[PDB]
Design a protein around this ligand. Structure first.
Ligand SMILES: [Cl-]
Length: 129
């Protein structure tokens, strides 16, 4: 599923991401835009053999199991394929664990490089929220 911008904003808010760990809802929409372009089915391999999955590109080395990543930890205790569903519940629950770990949203390279320090609130403007 390719979410609309305001459509994904409403869903992330419904699942309690707005202001989660102090990160306003705009930070999460911006991150999804640049990690996956709002596409729940996005997958991208990394150099270390792991792969990033879903609308927030969660990694198979530590967080989910795709059965092909050596040293997998599956800390979110889910198959990575669950991160590609049209229902973002699984990606949201795992993202909550990631952002709580210690480095905050810096765990998302696209957020650090393209969202952090910008007008992230622009990513929810015009949305009926
Ligand atoms: Cl915001």
């Amino acid at each position: 599923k390719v979410f609309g911008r305001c459509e994904l904003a409403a869903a992330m808010k419904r699942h309690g991401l707005d202001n989660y760990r102090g990160y306003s809802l705009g930070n999460w929409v911006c991150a999804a835009k640049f990690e996956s372009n709002f596409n729940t089915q996005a997958t991208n391999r990394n150099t270390d053999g792991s792969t990033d999955y879903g609308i927030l590109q969660i990694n198979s080395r530590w967080w989910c199991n795709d059965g092909r990543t050596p040293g997998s930890r599956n800390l979110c205790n889910i198959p990575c394929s669950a991160l590609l569903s049209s229902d973002i519940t699984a990606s949201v629950n795992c993202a909550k664990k990631i952002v709580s770990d210690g480095n905050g949203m810096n765990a998302w390279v696209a957020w650090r490089n393209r969202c952090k320090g910008t007008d992230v609130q622009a990513w929810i403007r015009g949305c009926r929220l």
